[PDB]
């Protein structure tokens, strides 16, 4: 089931692009407010 | 149709992470400016 | 060749993300400092 | 191998992306704060 589990590969990627993408936004917000 | 669902699924899930991280990046701008 | 199909279309829905949260960040800056 | 073809180039797309929003933060923060 290949194609499956690249899509889980990628779906991976993006969870984990995504999450530091809001930390880090989130964080630069306290930061600075 | 086993690509296409995988494509639909990986786009949905860019399609969220993209809103999320803008809606995030204005309300800290709404924040501080 | 759907796979490589697929894949386009992926890379433009990551093409566009991409460049819509760069540029606002850089118009959150611009507004702020 | 193109299943796996297409996972790596959309994964480097992924973390390029990734790479430059967290830049972009940073710098943005390191400029108001
Ligand atoms: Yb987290
Ligand atoms: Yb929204
Ligand atoms: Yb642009
Ligand atoms: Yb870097």
Known sequence: ???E????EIAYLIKKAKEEI???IKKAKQEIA
């Open 1 to 3: 089931a290949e194609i």
């Open 5 to 8: 589990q690249a899509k889980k």
């Open 22 to 24: 809001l930390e880090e």
